Curated annotation (Swiss-Prot), chain A:
Disulfide bonds: none annotated. The keyword Kinase does not apply. One of its GO terms (cellular component) is RNA polymerase complex. This is DNA-directed RNA polymerase subunit omega. Its EC number is 2.7.7.6. Belongs to the RNA polymerase subunit omega family.
Swiss-Prot record, chain B:
This is DNA-directed RNA polymerase subunit beta'. The RNAP catalytic core consists of 2 alpha, 1 beta, 1 beta' and 1 omega subunit. When a sigma factor is associated with the core the holoenzyme is formed, which can initiate transcription. The rRNA transcription and antitermination complex (rrnTAC) consists of RNAP, NusA, NusB, NusE (rpsJ), NusG, SubB, ribosomal protein S4, DNA and precursor rRNA; S4 is more flexible than other subunits. Belongs to the RNA polymerase beta' chain family. DNA-dependent RNA polymerase (RNAP) catalyzes the transcription of DNA into RNA using the four ribonucleoside triphosphates as substrates. Co-administration of salinamide and rifampicin or salinamide and myxopyronin suppresses the emergence of resistance to both antibiotics.
Swiss-Prot record, chain C:
One of its GO terms (cellular component) is cytosolic DNA-directed RNA polymerase complex. (Microbial infection) ADP-ribosylated on both alpha subunits by the phage T4 protein ModA. ADP-ribosylated on only one of the alpha subunits by the phage T4 protein Alt. The N-terminal domain is essential for RNAP assembly and basal transcription, whereas the C-terminal domain is involved in interaction with transcriptional regulators (such as CRP) and with upstream promoter elements. This is DNA-directed RNA polymerase subunit alpha. DNA-dependent RNA polymerase (RNAP) catalyzes the transcription of DNA into RNA using the four ribonucleoside triphosphates as substrates. This subunit plays an important role in subunit assembly since its dimerization is the first step in the sequential assembly of subunits to form the holoenzyme. Part of the processive rRNA transcription and antitermination complex (rrnTAC). The complex forms an RNA-chaperone ring around the RNA exit tunnel of RNAP. It supports rapid transcription and antitermination of rRNA operons, cotranscriptional rRNA folding, and annealing of distal rRNA regions to allow correct ribosome biogenesis. The chain holds residues 6 to 232 of 329 of the full protein. It is an enzyme of class 2 (transferase). The gene is rpoA. Residues 157-160 are annotated as: Required for interaction with Crp at class II promoters. Residues 1-227 are annotated as: Alpha N-terminal domain (alpha-NTD). GO terms for molecular function: DNA binding; DNA-directed RNA polymerase activity; protein dimerization activity.
UniProtKB/Swiss-Prot annotation, chain F:
Residues 13-66 are annotated as: Sigma-70 factor domain-4. Disulfide bonds: none annotated. Residues 39-58 bind DNA. This is RNA polymerase sigma factor RpoD. It comes from Escherichia coli (strain K12). Residues 50-65 are annotated as: Interaction with anti-sigma factors. The chain holds residues 535 to 612 of 613 of the full protein. Sigma factors are initiation factors that promote the attachment of RNA polymerase to specific initiation sites and are then released. This sigma factor is the primary sigma factor during exponential growth. Preferentially transcribes genes associated with fast growth, such as ribosomal operons, other protein-synthesis related genes, rRNA- and tRNA-encoding genes and prfB. Interacts transiently with the RNA polymerase catalytic core formed by RpoA, RpoB, RpoC and RpoZ (2 alpha, 1 beta, 1 beta' and 1 omega subunit) to form the RNA polymerase holoenzyme that can initiate transcription. Identified in a complex containing RpoD, the RNA polymerase subunits RpoA, RpoB and RpoZ, CRP and DNA. Interacts with Rsd; this prevents interaction with the RNA polymerase catalytic core and with promoter DNA, and as a consequence, promotes transcription from promoters that require alternative sigma factors. (Microbial infection) Interacts with Escherichia phage lambda antitermination protein Q. The record marks R28 as: Interaction with anti-sigma factors. The gene is rpoD. It is found in: Cytoplasm. The lineage of its organism: Bacteria, Pseudomonadati, Pseudomonadota, Gammaproteobacteria, Enterobacterales. It comes from the Bacteria. Belongs to the sigma-70 factor family. RpoD/SigA subfamily.
Amino acid sequence: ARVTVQDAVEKIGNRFDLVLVAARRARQMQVGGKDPLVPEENDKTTVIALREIEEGLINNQILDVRERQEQQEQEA
Amino acid sequence: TTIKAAKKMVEREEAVVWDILDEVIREHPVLLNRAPTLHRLGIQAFEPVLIEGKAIQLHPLVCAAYNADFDGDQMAVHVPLTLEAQLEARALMMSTNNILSPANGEPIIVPSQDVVLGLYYMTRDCVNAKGEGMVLTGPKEAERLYRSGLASLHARVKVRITEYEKDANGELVAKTSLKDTTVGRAILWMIVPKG
Amino acid sequence: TEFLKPRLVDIEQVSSTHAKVTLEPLERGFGHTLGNALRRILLSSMPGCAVTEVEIDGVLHEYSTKEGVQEDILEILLNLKGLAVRVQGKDEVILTLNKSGIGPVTAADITHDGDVEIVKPQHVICHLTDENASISMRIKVQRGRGYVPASTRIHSEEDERPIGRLLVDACYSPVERIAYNVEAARVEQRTDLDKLVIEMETNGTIDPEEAIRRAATILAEQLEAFV
Amino acid sequence: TEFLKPRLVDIEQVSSTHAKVTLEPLERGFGHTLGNALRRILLSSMPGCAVTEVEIDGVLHEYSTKEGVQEDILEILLNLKGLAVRVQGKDEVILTLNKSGIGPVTAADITHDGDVEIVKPQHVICHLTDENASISMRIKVQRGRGYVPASTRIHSEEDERPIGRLLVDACYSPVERIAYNVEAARVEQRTDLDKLVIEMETNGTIDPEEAIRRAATILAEQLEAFVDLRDPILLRPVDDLELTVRSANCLKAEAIHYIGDLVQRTEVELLKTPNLGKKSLTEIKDVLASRGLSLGMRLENWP
Amino acid sequence: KPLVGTGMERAVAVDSGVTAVAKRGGVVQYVDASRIVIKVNEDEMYPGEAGIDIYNLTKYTRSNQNTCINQMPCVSLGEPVERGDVLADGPSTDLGELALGQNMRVAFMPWNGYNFEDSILVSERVVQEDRFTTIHIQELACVSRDTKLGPEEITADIPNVGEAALSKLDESGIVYIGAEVTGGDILVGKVTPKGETQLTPEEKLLRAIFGEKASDVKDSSLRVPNGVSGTVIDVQVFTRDGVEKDKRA
Amino acid sequence: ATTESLRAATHDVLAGLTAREAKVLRMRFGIDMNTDYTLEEVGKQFDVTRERIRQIEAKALRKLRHPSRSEVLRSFLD
Ligand SMILES: [Mg+2]
């Protein structure tokens, strides 16, 4: 997702909610301590979050249930 | 170790700070901005590389979208700090996100004057045409006989070109035939994708 | 006297013969020099074997159509011009095409010799349209250097030829389109150094990174008596 | 028709500056490739001798004046870089030039050694216009390649050099303009072979017979990569463990100078040591385990 | 030398005034790098003068655009110079002709898109031969104003800096004449006596632990702006009446 | 940067001090406290004799002045 995000915007649907959930995933990647689902190959967390977006593994409700599972694990 | 030790490493220009700047500069877009801007495409983001000199090497295709010819225009370069603004720079206002203009459907990030002059010299045809009679196998042989010097860039010959069109729902079909064209159009077709 | 040599290569092979070879780092300005000194010796001074003449015996021009074929004679001559063949013993090796019935004439319905080794037999040549429409031609494979076109030999060959002897565009080197772009790659203290990304697509009978070594030892033989 | 190798068959010399060297024989493709390759690698990456550092007495900076010199000393540095010297033996030499009396300061009166050679003694450097105020300076010639400015050498050299050492732009490339022409060679068995004459317009500080042999050498080294390829913890004192002084002050009595002499200690000797019997030995083992070591760890030739 | 001219070049230098103008014409007697002495002939000789017109040529002074002004002598020794001619070319002149820049080989052709929208693509020889290099004389007045908390002294002992940064300084903190300074170093050590600002308790603990005792001296010396290399050509020192002078002044 | 990173460094290093010396040193200078106290005011809470707090402060100084584990605190002198 370094040169092209058109596959991401056609699998998500729009730009703004895509970049909002991508920034939410990157904020959960930077200080949240989560492991990336995409290999790094000497890249920062932003294009890693975009590659997780364009792989179909990160969405709005997917990140919602992903943070809900962590909240239920922490509050147990 | 600390902040001021890294500051003294910056002020004395250590060898390793160039490598760490190359590490932090990749996957980190930055916003280039002409002052004053003419339209929305007078400011957009860019993924910078590290070179020497004291100036910004701008990509030539988007200078028409800037309408900023190389007259010593003082461009401001703004850094998005957080990951929200970094992904907003990378996924929405990067130059790879918009090939059209917000004013009209025609691209204002079209090939500009020098590269369109080179492309017009590439697609031009002659009557003398010293590479006459040789039938070219495709784009490969076209660029081969242009770069070897035995044939010119202007030769009205027949070239077997593989072309594709998505007549179905995204399904491209393969076909190859002979077309009355020139060598440089086939060398451009080497750079032209399938669709 | 330092003469800094590259360290990393990282050959990227897209297809079976699309080995894009990179080179990092070089000196200031050796990128374009080593990219143009290796490209044009693959274009003009690289030995190999391909088809030079044809003996279709019944077609005497490039535009005169025939019977039993699908496309024109120029298209099958172009398909004959692109052929992954390489001989070992002789140089002017003559082959024969044999195809009868009804079907697409691929690169497997030809008479090969002991020194003839076909690498890409999936190269389509012609298509038999009519039922029991047989065709036959002689494939004259001659060893050449780089490329020679038909216009440089159609003026010299003034002697009388029989009906069927045409001039094939001989791709005398076994390499396809060679190109390179010089990217500016840096070391920890300098940025005037440059990477040499050699994007080379190639036909059969030769590996592209082996063709790099062949061109390198050819140019080293061109400068062997200078040290 | 398989392969063919060229050879330096003639070295023509019009003057000390001009040199029309030729290469013979070459093929159709080899005539233009070997001319384009050998022109580029000899133009920039040619090891020559240029002026780097000049310290003139009486002045302090490179924008200063002097008595009876008729020109600024910044102009003198612009003609020293256009002055060719043939330093053969050594890689660096401190050339000194002294001149008195009214007249132009040429390069023929340079107090030089035997290993160097000024090939252009009639080159104008300065113009001394006073007999009492003479001119004298040192010239630090360096053997380098390409071209390096004054700002690049000071970024890679952070030493303590005295003032007055004026940095000069080291134009290490001695050549000025190089040409090559592709004509037809004179071979009786194959007329289609091509000759190649290389017009080498340069200064006298480089041998044109050696300039071909040096430029073809560097291209062979670049093709060499083408055709072939593709304990600080034990060396520590005692006190940096932040050990409690209940046992650390007592182990200094027998023998304690390094941390390697503490891991070789045994428990029966620490039992006889006062205030090191039972409890503080576990604290010593714990602070050794905090650094990864342990009691009774044998060192292999530490001092 | 300006190759392509207009004919106006032979008068703009003489009419500008920055060059050495010939008020009285004669024969060149002695030419230095900083002055030109021309011997006036008998026809332009006055009985109330000495027959010698010395032209004190202005050396490297500062202009109003941070560039150099240098009246370089261009005439040779022992040649007649008549009335109204040139003796020393100014900062952008050559032998009485307006030398605005340099002349070199220019090719109106595209090369790899570098001259895309009227941009310049240079060779190495514009800086290898030092053709387009330029002297730029700036000004940086380290001013020692007098506040209420003591006047600003100019000394050499500066805290929170290394000895290599103070290696090119004297006991007064000023660089010697000809010091090749780099962007970021201190050119004049001009510290100020600061007031006792209230410290954070972490820095108070740091002062209690180690021997770092930052007194009223404050690192407020005006350093070199970063990216600007070069040497020094002059250090003008001025002072108020009633103030003593150090060894550098 | 340093006005918070030095605070985090003291909060990391002085947390390793597993006794009341960190508790009487954080109010000796005012770290994570409002009012700066002398030896007398920290004495009335714990140790009313001033020289006991002075001796435990000197012991913490002798622990911290060695360049073995407070080197990250040593690098903050600039
Ligand atoms: Mg403008």
